[PDB]
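User: C-alpha cells for this complex, please. No commentary.
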Amino acid sequence: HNFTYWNPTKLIFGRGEVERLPEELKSYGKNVLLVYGGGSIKRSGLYDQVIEQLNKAGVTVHELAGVEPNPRVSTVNKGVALCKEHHIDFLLAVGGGSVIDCTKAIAAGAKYDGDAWDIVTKKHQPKDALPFGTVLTLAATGSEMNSGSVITNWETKEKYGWGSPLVFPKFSILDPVNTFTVPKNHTIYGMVDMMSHVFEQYFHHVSNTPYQDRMCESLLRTVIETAPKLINDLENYELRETILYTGTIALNGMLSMGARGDWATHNIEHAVSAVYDIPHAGGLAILFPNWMRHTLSENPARMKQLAVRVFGVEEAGKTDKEVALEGIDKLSAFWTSLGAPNRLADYDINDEQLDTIADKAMAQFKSLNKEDVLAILKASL
Amino acid sequence: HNFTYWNPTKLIFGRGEVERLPEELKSYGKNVLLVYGGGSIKRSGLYDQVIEQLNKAGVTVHELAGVEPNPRVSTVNKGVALCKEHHIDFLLAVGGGSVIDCTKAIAAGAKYDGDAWDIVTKKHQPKDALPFGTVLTLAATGSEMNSGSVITNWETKEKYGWGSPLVFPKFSILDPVNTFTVPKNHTIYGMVDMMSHVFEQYFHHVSNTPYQDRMCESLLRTVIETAPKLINDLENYELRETILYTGTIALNGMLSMGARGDWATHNIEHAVSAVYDIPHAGGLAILFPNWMRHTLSENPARMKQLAVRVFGVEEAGKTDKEVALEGIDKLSAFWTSLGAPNRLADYDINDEQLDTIADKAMAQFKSLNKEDVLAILKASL
Ligand SMILES: NC(=O)c1ccc[n+]([C@@H]2O[C@H](COP(=O)([O-])OP(=O)(O)OC[C@H]3O[C@@H](n4cnc5c(N)ncnc54)[C@H](OP(=O)(O)O)[C@@H]3O)[C@@H](O)[C@H]2O)c1
Ligand SMILES: NC(=O)c1ccc[n+]([C@@H]2O[C@H](COP(=O)([O-])OP(=O)(O)OC[C@H]3O[C@@H](n4cnc5c(N)ncnc54)[C@H](OP(=O)(O)O)[C@@H]3O)[C@@H](O)[C@H]2O)c1
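Assistant:
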C-alpha cells in the first residue's frame, strides 16, 4: 500500500458545516443509527444540532451512546443488535477515533452473522457493510477518511486493528468549532497521533518523492509551532482550524494508504492499551521515541533529515547519528513540553506485566521479536 | 464546492505501475473499451504494455483510437456506439486530458439514449455511467482524478465543460516514465494548467486556511523551479517525477472540488479553442494573466501575497497594487521564459473573429460581460 493513494471519503470543511447533513443524507436510507461517546457532544451543544439536522433530513433516529475510548467489542456487538432491531440503513458517527472506529465495526458487523470479534481478528473478511458518515469532534486520527478500525476485547485484554475498503466513511464533516471542547490531554494526543502518521510515511524506504518529503517536513513544523499556542488557548478558532486542517485535508497530499493504515504497525502501543486502557497516543508518546532509538537505521539519513529540517538541529561538529538521535530527543522533548507522558510510570505502570505485554504484542528489515519489544518496554518505564 | 474536498479515485504512483492493471481490473467486467489518442502511446511502447496487461487480466479488448486534442463529440458518439455494439463493461483511458475527458463522455453517453452533446451542454444530467480507469501519459490536467470533462463540437465551434460524480475515474495509474515522451510544448502546457488550478483555489474568497495558502505557495514555487530544468532535459526521471507528483497527489492536500471543477471558469479559453483548436493551456498562457489584470481585486491582498511569497517581488517603495500587478507580470514572464505563447498572434490569430469569440464565451462579484471579454481578447492580441 506504500505506492497507493486512496481517500474516497467526501470531506466538508468549515464553520457550521453540520448543516450539510440533510444534503449528504438525501441519497441514503431513512433509518439512521447515531453513534457517539460518553456525553461530550451533549455538553458542547453538538448533539442538539445533529438531532435538528436529522429531523430536517426526515430520518428516523435511534442511538448508540457511550462508546468508550479504546472501543470495546461488546459495544460493537450492541450496535450490531440495534441495527437489526431498528432496520438501520445508515450510521452517523459523531465523535473521535474511538466512535468512528466503533461505527466501522458496527457497519461491518451488521452484515455478518457472527460475533464482530471475528472481523477484528480477521477470522471473517467483511463482504458487505452498512454505509456511514462522520462528524469529527477531535483532530484527528484519520479514521474519518481511512478504512481501518482498532477494537479492544477487554475480557481477553486484546486490541487489534483491521480494515476493509467497505468501511471508508462516505462523508465526513470537519468543523473546527466541533473540536473546541476537546480537553488538553486529548488535544495533545490528537496531535501526537497526527505527527506519528507523518513519521510512518516518511520512514518508508524509497517510496517518497523529494517534494513529498518537503510536504511532510512542513506539516510537522506547522504542528510543532501551533501546538504550544493551542494548549494554552483551547477555544481559539484559528489554532483549532490549523490543527484540524493539517490533520485532515493536508495529509491527503502526502500520506500513502500504507501510512493511513499504520494501525498495523503499533503492536506495542496496542498491547499496553489492551492491558491498561491507556490512550493510544499516550502510548505513542511513551514508546514511539524509544522504538525509533531501538531501530534507528545505520544509515540515519531519513531521521537525520527530520532532525535538521524539522527540529532545527545544527549538524556542525556532530556525527550524522548524533544529529539523528538529537532529533528524536527533540521530538520527545517537544511532546513532553505540551504535557504528553514520557514514561510508563506516568500512567502508574510498572514492570510487573512487561512479559505478558510483549507476548501480546508478538501475537522485513528491522522487524521486532519478543526481546526487542521487552527492551523497548524497559527503556520506557 | 469551495468547502468540499472529494477525490475518490484510487491513485497508484510509481515506475512500472501499469503492472497493477490486472489487480485493479479484477473488480470489473471483462468487456473493455481501450481509448487512446493519435499514436504516441504506440511509439513509446506503452500500448504494447497495456495490451499485455489486458491479456493477463483475461479481458476482451476493443479499441477507440484517434481521440484528438480538444476531443470532438463525434468521437464520443462513436465510442458510445462501440459500447453498445460490444456490450462494454468498463473503459480504460490511456492518454492525456483529452483522452480521459473523452472517455468520461463515452462512459456517461453509454447510459443515455440521445446525442452525447446533450450531456456536454448540460441539457441531460447523467443518471448512470459505465465505470472506467486511466493510465496517465501527460502531467496533469486533473481529469485523472476529478469529475469533469471538456468536449468540442467542431461543427458548431463550441467547447464546453460538464461534470458528474458518476464519472470520477475508479483508479488512475501514475508513472513518470509514461510522460517521458510528452513533447516540449505539451510539457509546458501541462505545467501551465497545473499552476492555473492552484491559482483558482487561491483566489477563492474566505475559504483557504493559512496553512493551505502555504501549501499552494510552495507548490507553485516548486513547479517554477522545476519547469526550466525539465524543458531542457525531457527524459529525466526525477524531473518528470516532481512534475507528476506536484500535479497529482500533492494537489489532493490543497485543492477544493471547486478548484478541480475550474473547467467552468475558462469560458474565454474555451471559445478560442472552439474556433481555432489551440491547446487549452496555450489559451491560458495568453489570456489568464490579462483576465487577472482585468479583474484584479480592489483589495489586492491575495495577489500581493502571491506576488511576494511565490514570485519574490520586493514590495519596498511600491503600492500593494503595483506589487500585485508586478506579480502578474512575473507570472507571464515566467511562462514565456519556458516557451509558452503570450499573444494570440503566436497562434496566427488576429482580431477578425473577436466578436464571435466573445459571443461564444458569453453563451457573482467580478463576473464578466461581453465588453469584459472583448477587452481581455484585445489586450491579448
Ligand atoms: N482507524 C485508524 O486508522 C486509527 C488511527 C489512529 C488511532 N485510532 C484509534 O482512535 C482512538 C483514539 O481516538 P481519538 O484520539 O480521536 O480519541 P477518542 O478515544 O475517540 O476520545 C478521547 C476523548 O476525547 C473526548 N472527546 C472527543 N471529542 C471531544 C470534544 N469535542 N469535546 C470534548 N471531549 C471530546 C471524548 O469524550 P466523550 O466520549 O464524552 O465524547 C473521549 O473521552 C484509539 O482507540 C486509536 O486506537 C484509529
Ligand atoms: N477534466 C478537467 O477538469 C480538465 C482540466 C484541464 C484541462 N482539460 C482539458 O484537457 C485537454 C488537454 O489535455 P492535455 O494537456 O493532457 O493534452 P492532450 O490534449 O490530452 O494531448 C496533447 C498532446 O500530447 C500528446 N501526448 C500525450 N501524452 C504523450 C506522451 N507520453 N508522449 C508523447 N506525446 C503525448 C498527445 O499525442 P497523442 O494523441 O498521439 O497521444 C497530444 O497530441 C483539453 O481539452 C482541456 O480542455 C480538462
